[PDB]
Design an enzyme around this catalytic site. Structure first.
Site: not given
Ligand SMILES: O=C(c1cc(Cn2c(=O)[nH]c(=O)c3ccccc32)ccc1F)N1CCN(CC(F)(F)F)CC1
Length: 351
Positions: A202-203, A211, A218, A244, A247, A328
């Site tokens: 996770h990047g 955070g 989260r 990852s 990101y 993914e």
């Molecule tokens: O894991 C994610 C997330 C992250 C991404 C983009 N992304 C990403 O940011 N890092 C990745 O390593 C990744 C890997 C595969 C696919 C997408 C990735 C797209 C949608 C998402 F919901 N989230 C949303 C942002 N979250 C923080 C909060 F706003 F909710 F707090 C953390 C969980």
């Protein structure tokens, strides 16, 4: 002050993650106006209300006019001031706009957490603020030794899973840390023996890390538009380090990034090929797997402390008409992740 007994790399890690100027830099990168919305005026209820308005804009886009949309678009800019001078800001009238702003709000949610830790708290000039800030993470962080077995496996994971389509840069691992967020081992207990537990990437941008380490990874909140996230509001991981690492949003202008390795309890995967904006999983599934055209060679999976590590070179998955070039994975309960490591990476941009 007493000068701090933490290892140099742990100290440099705390320096990067709590850096105020980096926080501001990220905000201007998203076109926020820092005079109208400074870092110190950021709050949760303002981010949430902005998420709501973006859910209104999502509704109107789903049901098809540039005129009835103007009002919704403007309300978003009222809540989160953007840097457009004497203006007319661009119209938020499509799915791309909702995704783009939802991402922006995700980042503000973590930056608000980082800043609140910095401004809550006590002030004592006899303490090294490095030490003060470390403690606020409620996370044990140790340096993993370069010659250990776990180091060798992690470096191979990095070495083998850099996609050819991301060849504009490569990565060197600068420091490997082992991390243990307080209470997280306890939270994960129900899943600690589930089948299909995988060590995955996770990047995120460096300004989110305070955070993530204080609160864990989260899920985007109720108010957030489900449509802004390809597989809905979950926590997203990759098996390819470069997918990852994109990101991190590093560049020639700041090429040091941070990436996590999490133990993820995937169990029974709901396998998908295209966008599905789900808010719950089908009965009996524990995760979503977005099916990649290319996957780590299944036969080179190795074990690290009982957890599968998919560190093989990429080969064809055999999946045919998919939206995704790579795999993914998404979970929808925060308790299904247990964070294990944190890498500091150097990005060599070949361009
Ligand atoms: O894991 C994610 C997330 C992250 C991404 C983009 N992304 C990403 O940011 N890092 C990745 O390593 C990744 C890997 C595969 C696919 C997408 C990735 C797209 C949608 C998402 F919901 N989230 C949303 C942002 N979250 C923080 C909060 F706003 F909710 F707090 C953390 C969980």
């Amino acid at each position: 002050h007493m000068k701090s007994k933490l290892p140099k790399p742990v100290q440099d890690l705390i320096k990067m993650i709590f850096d105020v100027e980096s926080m501001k830099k990220a905000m201007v990168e998203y076109e926020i106006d820092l005079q109208k919305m400074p870092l110190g005026k950021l709050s949760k209820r303002q981010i949430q209300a902005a998420y709501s308005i973006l859910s209104e804009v999502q509704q109107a886009v789903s049901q098809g006019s540039d005129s009835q949309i103007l009002d919704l678009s403007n309300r978003f800019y009222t809540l989160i001031p953007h840097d457009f001078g004497m203006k007319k800001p661009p119209l938020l009238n499509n799915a791309d706009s909702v995704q783009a702003k939802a991402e922006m709000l995700d980042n503000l949610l973590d930056i608000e957490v980082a800043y609140s830790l910095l401004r809550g708290g006590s002030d004592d000039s006899s303490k090294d603020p490095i030490d003060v800030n470390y403690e606020k993470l409620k996370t044990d962080i140790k340096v993993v030794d370069r010659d250990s077995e776990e180091a060798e496996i992690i470096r191979k994971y990095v070495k083998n899973t850099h996609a050819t389509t991301h060849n504009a840069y490569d990565l060197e691992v600068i420091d490997i840390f082992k991390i243990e967020r307080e209470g997280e081992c306890q939270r994960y207990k129900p899943f600690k023996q589930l089948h299909n537990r995988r060590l995955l990437w996770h990047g995120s941008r460096t300004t989110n890390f305070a955070g993530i380490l204080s609160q864990g990874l989260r899920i985007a909140p109720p108010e957030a538009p489900v449509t802004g996230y390809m597989f809905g509001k979950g926590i997203y991981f990759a098996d390819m380090v470069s997918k990852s690492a994109n990101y991190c949003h590093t560049s020639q202008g700041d090429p040091i990034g941070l990436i996590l390795l999490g133990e993820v309890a995937l169990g029974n995967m709901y396998e998908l090929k295209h966008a599905s904006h789900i808010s719950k999983l089908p009965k009996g599934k524990h995760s979503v797997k977005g099916l990649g055209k290319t996957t780590p060679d299944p036969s080179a999976n190795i074990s690290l402390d009982g957890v599968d590590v998919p560190l093989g070179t990429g080969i064809s998955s055999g999946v045919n008409d998919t939206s995704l070039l790579y795999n993914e994975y998404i979970v929808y309960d925060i308790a299904q992740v247990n964070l294990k490591y944190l890498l500091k990476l150097k990005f060599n941009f070949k361009t």
